């Protein structure tokens, strides 16, 4: 005869008090700190995009890819802006459009760094005839073709995982004493890995294509940035996983949020920041 799981009445209590709703709100200190980090991320990314549409015709940028590079930068901006679908009152659209819409852009952009790595490898390791053929082929639409291929794969996988297991909201009444925890629940790492597979595959492929290339003698190498950028992504996921498995329930929404930030902050400091810095100093270099 104990006040219903809606009310948890502490000891020696003749009158019940209702369990207040518990959800990661938009005013917690943590969300403010992470949104400030978001502001920094957006500032640096947009500075990069401006620079990359500034010197578009320059030889340095031409070697980087240009319009594919601009597509990549805009898609990274999109993913960074998609860090605001996690916090707040659980809602069905936000539950169902949180992970897929945050993982699609990363793959749609990382296709481009894979293109760069493939082009380097084409000369670095293959024989001469195939090297010439691939140089003459990949330089053209082939890049946009591969971008589209990755996008189609990612959408198909998203739909499959969706229908198989659409994450839903849940209410727990016995996690903490005086509050009912409402949070969006998932299924182990099934959906996590299913939504993680493709960009991980591409990242590994770039790393193995560009790891061994001899550093350009007395010159900046196009391999160093790609390698150090990919290791950032690998380390980020491998390092947060234990945390997300071993943290307070309520702050769980607040862990995924963080990863996507730090990871991007790595890439924009391993492939785009160096070229952008050079460009800044291109007028002074010559």
């Amino acid at each position: 005869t104990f006040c219903g799981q809606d009310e948890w009445s502490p000891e020696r209590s003749t009158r019940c008090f209702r369990r207040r709703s518990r959800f990661l709100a938009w005013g917690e200190p943590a969300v403010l700190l992470l949104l400030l980090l978001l502001s920094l991320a957006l500032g640096l990314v947009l500075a990069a995009l401006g620079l990359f549409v500034h010197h578009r015709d320059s030889p340095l940028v031409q070697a980087s890819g240009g319009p594919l590079a601009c597509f990549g930068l805009v898609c990274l901006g999109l993913v960074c802006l998609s860090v605001l679908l996690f916090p707040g009152q659980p809602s069905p659209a936000r539950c169902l459009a949180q992970q897929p819409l945050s993982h699609l852009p990363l793959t749609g952009c990382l296709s481009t760094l894979f293109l760069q790595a493939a082009e380097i490898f084409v000369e670095s390791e293959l024989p001469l005839s195939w090297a010439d053929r691939l140089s003459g082929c990949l330089r053209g639409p082939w890049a946009w073709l591969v971008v589209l291929l990755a996008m189609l794969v990612e959408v198909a996988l998203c739909t499959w995982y969706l229908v198989a297991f659409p994450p839903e909201v849940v209410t727990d009444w016995h996690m903490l004493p005086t509050e009912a925890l409402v949070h969006c629940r998932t299924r182990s790492w099934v959906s996590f890995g299913l939504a993680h597979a493709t960009n991980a595959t591409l990242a590994f492929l770039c790393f193995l294509g560009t790891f061994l290339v001899r550093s350009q003698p007395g010159c900046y190498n196009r391999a160093r940035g790609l390698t150090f950028a990919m290791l950032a992504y690998f380390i980020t996921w491998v390092s947060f996983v234990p945390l997300l498995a071993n943290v307070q329930v309520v702050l769980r929404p607040a862990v995924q949020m963080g990863a996507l930030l730090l990871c991007v902050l790595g890439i924009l400091a391993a492939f785009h920041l160096p070229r952008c810095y050079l460009l800044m100093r291109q007028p002074g270099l010559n």
């Binding site: 182990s188 790492w189 590994f204 193995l208 790891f211 061994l212 001899r214 491998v238 996983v241 234990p242 498995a245």
Partner: protein
């Protein structure tokens, strides 16, 4: 009053106390009757076992083909650059590895757990120490004979790398016996969270602690080998072995880190199959990332096979 799983209302007899239903027998609450705690072990029709079976079959076929092809070209300098019969001492052992995966399927007892714990992990240490000392050759044999010729030239003349590999084998035997004494051969029984009705039976090192009991010196060997190989990634070109060594080491490291991360969280009744998967994968690493390429060079291009070309390249 109720009683939580493992203690059943003794409705089969005096019902005042929720006596413990002995042995596998078990009930949730009240629940006069008692169930059975059925044990489960890696099965046949299970798809994952079939996947691993294909993975262990194709790779073994690949090693067998490479064995015959290498053997029938004893004269070509490619086969002679592998160190000689030593390379065969490598290849043969790897077969045993793939030959043992069918020890991980079937009911577990001491008979097969002995193999699982002692035979299979014997080879891996030697088979990675061979590559470790191989990198030792590539770099040191002339680096120290050119950086410390004062004694090195004659000091490593007589105690060829074979003994240095033998000492590592010795350490491996010591550690294996120490661990076997430290624990038992008793098969281990555990409770499956999916439902109390199911339980698990496995060999003793199933615990990741006892599994890591051995993945320390092996990882040390792998890291040292990768370091030395990268040292001569492209500066030397003996027969392009530094490159392949690097690739194989990278694959090993990725497999290790992947398994560690996955087992941090746990996946119920999956650890057996995931473990078998990683073991077979790290065997394929070597079997088709060290030996396959030389099979290709031997059987497609004579650009190396010619005696003149290899007497040209040995000096450089």
């Amino acid at each position: 009053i109720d009683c939580l799983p493992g203690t059943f209302l003794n409705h089969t007899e005096d019902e005042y106390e929720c006596q413990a239903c002995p042995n596998n027998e078990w009930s949730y609450q009240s629940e006069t009757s008692c169930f059975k705690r059925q044990l489960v072990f890696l099965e046949w029709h299970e798809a994952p076992t079939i996947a691993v079976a294909l993975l262990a079959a194709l790779g073994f076929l690949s090693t067998l083909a490479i064995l015959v092809i290498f053997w029938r070209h004893f004269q070509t300098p490619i086969v002679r650059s592998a160190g000689g019969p030593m390379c065969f001492l490598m290849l043969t052992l790897l077969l045993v590895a793939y030959m043992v995966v069918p020890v991980y399927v079937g009911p577990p007892k001491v008979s097969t757990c002995l193999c699982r714990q002692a035979l299979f992990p014997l080879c891996f240490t030697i088979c990675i120490s061979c590559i470790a000392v191989r990198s030792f050759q590539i770099v040191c044999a002339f680096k120290m004979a050119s950086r410390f010729p004062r004694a090195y030239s004659y000091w490593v003349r007589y105690q060829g790398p074979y003994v240095s590999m033998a000492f590592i084998t010795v350490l491996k035997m010591v550690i294996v016996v120490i661990g076997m004494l430290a624990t038992g051969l008793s098969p281990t029984t555990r409770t499956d969270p999916d439902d109390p009705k199911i339980t698990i039976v496995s060999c003793n090192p199933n615990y990741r602690n006892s599994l890591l009991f051995n993945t320390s010196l092996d990882l040390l060997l792998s890291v040292v080998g990768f370091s030395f190989a990268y040292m001569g990634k492209e500066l030397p070109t003996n027969y392009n072995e530094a490159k392949f060594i690097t690739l194989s080491m990278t694959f090993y490291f990725t497999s290790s880190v992947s398994l560690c991360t996955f087992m941090s969280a746990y996946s119920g009744v999956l650890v057996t199959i995931v473990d078998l998967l990683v073991t077979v994968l790290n065997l394929l690493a070597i079997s088709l990332g060290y030996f396959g390429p030389k099979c290709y060079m031997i059987l497609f291009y004579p650009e190396r096979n010619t005696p003149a070309y290899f007497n040209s390249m040995i000096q450089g």
